[model samples]
Target: KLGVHSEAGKLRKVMVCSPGLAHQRLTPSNCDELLFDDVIWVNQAKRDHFDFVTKMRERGIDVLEMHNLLTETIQNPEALKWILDRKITADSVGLGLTSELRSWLESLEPRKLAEYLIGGVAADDLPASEGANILKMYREYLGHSSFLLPPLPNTQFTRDTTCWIYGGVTLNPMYWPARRQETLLTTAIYKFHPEFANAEFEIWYGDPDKDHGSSTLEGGDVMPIGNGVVLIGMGERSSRQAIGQVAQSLFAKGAAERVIVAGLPKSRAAMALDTVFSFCDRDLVTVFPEVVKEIVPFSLRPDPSSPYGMNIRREEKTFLEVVAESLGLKKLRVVETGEREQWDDGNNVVCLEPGVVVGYDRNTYTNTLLRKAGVEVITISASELGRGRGGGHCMTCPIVRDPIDY
Candidate 1:
């Protein structure tokens, strides 16, 4: 089934996006604008990502690539038209030739169209006859160095685009303009791709309209802990309003009974909850010590009489205390990670099953601590992948996992 009930459940199927040429779009001048901490060597990043995939496959997990899914989806004429209608509009292209551009885009094969959508397109790449003088003027206005369509470098972090909960999924509405288009690809695949056509699931949250002023929510801030409990982070990428909406939907659908909101610091370092905390096993979790101390817990439950059909209240208990109570555990084991380890995403490990996880090998301190706690840590190279400021958990979206009994 296409469902994920817990973070530590045995992962059966997952989705990922391998870093591609699109990453080359990030330069020193535009890295910050694109939300990348540093420009990475595309070659090395590919190798690092491959190693991550290889390790997961070796552990008997079905890994799906977003690019392939998108390509396959656009092969259907309806799906192709859907993309063209949304992408080739005058507002997005800013050109007077919306019809011509749409026709040209439709003429390309699915693979090429997918490439252009992901790696971006430049005036120089298109036929000169299409817009000759207008293209020249537009190029000159932008210093002849701008893309007609911006590359989606951050698509490599698939987790932020979509999240799978108990029996449904959330096609997250990204916070930044740089990442807004990413959800389009995910939404298309889920809606039209044959792979997901028969997959019984509901969309907990997502708006196909790109211009809507919907509250933002990203998968990196969402965690489904077993036994009808879900944890959502209220931080830079995920808003309180959006969290409430998702909580209400999950409650109405009976996917989740309790939603715990973790108030995270609004900063680049604490961009998402997974960056600072993740489950390593049914009774154990790894967290950045400083961030944990700063976290405030909020308990949310369905209430018919409440204004939003959900009751939200601040909890006096600590973050860990609330988590333990929710999961019916006596106490959760803690593996505190070091500052340096946190920066490298040491605490962002993705659990394959109980007591086994995948993380970057460079997080020595955190890995050692996890090992000491009797958790088997599977490590991978992240030299180039870490440049994007995401760890294993950030790079993957688990679609199916074995249900864990609480």
Candidate 2:
């Protein structure tokens, strides 16, 4: 059973993607277009990501790599057909020879196809033979641009693609066009990968026909706290419609008793909830001080009488006030991080267990503050990884954790 009922429980299984050659596609010119803050040193980023995974492994956590899972999933014949049917299309490739491209893609070995899917297909990658004239014509269609399918550099931020809750998961609908395909890949892995396919879990949200288009959500905005409460942040990356829909699903499925919605400032810095706030322990959180006054809280409970089967209650109290009340705490302890530290993802630490978290070494001030507050702050070098504007929290997605009974 793949399940996660809380944010700070003892992590049992997690998923992450190490920065790959696909990240090399991000140049200074195209970095912003791809939603990356800056061009990253891919090799160094891989090293940093490896260190992060190693730390989790040392703590007895099972770390699954997205690349490996995707590769294994596509090895299934039916899975390969399903992926190619959707991924290799005239509109997707921007080339008219859909059948030819599909046939060519079908011929590739699972590993090779996985690489092409994640690393992207460049003009030079096409066969230059006369027999493969369709590929040549597609290369011409590319013109000066190199890629046929743009590489998913942000795949390294695994938390944005899919999220796990109590005995269920949500394949998020990405907010940005650049990151949309990521959900498709993740969805494929969850649907077809043997491990996930055999697992007993429910999908709380993310039906393309129902949840796509304007209903955008991201895993980084979803947090499952203990005691049948889940916190979803509505921000630049997560839309209100999507948040409400997810709440409805959680309630309908009996995964949550109460859902707390935090209205966040619509800004790139606060792109996702985890970027600005994350749990350090059961009742402790590190938040960016600048956004504290701006946050508004709303509570949602299942109501069969309500139009949407969920009752949304607006509150005049502060964000922390609502959260504390939901958790039945007298008050929620906070470690306010500075702006300089927040930029480097100071507040974006991943909790391995209660009071123990992993953060970027670059966030010296924030890490020191966390240590002062009795948190076991484990630091990893993230100079290149931080260039992607995500920290440990964004890079990893917990699939299973020891359940916390509050």
Alpha carbon lDDT of each predicted model: 0.83, 0.81
Clashes of each: 0, 0
What TM-score against the true fold does each predicted structure earn?
Answer: 0.94, 0.92
Residue-level lDDT tens digits of model 2 in 13-36: 999998886787887777776777
Instruction: Name the weakest run of 10 consecutive residues (lDDT summed) in model 2.
Output: 129-138
RMSD, each candidate, Å? 2.2, 2.6
Best-performing candidate as measured by lDDT? 1
Residue 274 local lDDT, model 1: 88
91-157: candidate 1 lDDT, tens digit per residue: 8877666666667777898888887788777666666655645766766886554566778888898
What shift in Å separates residue 34 of candidate 1 from its native position after superposition? 2.6
lDDT score at residue 121, model 1, on the 0-100 scale: 71
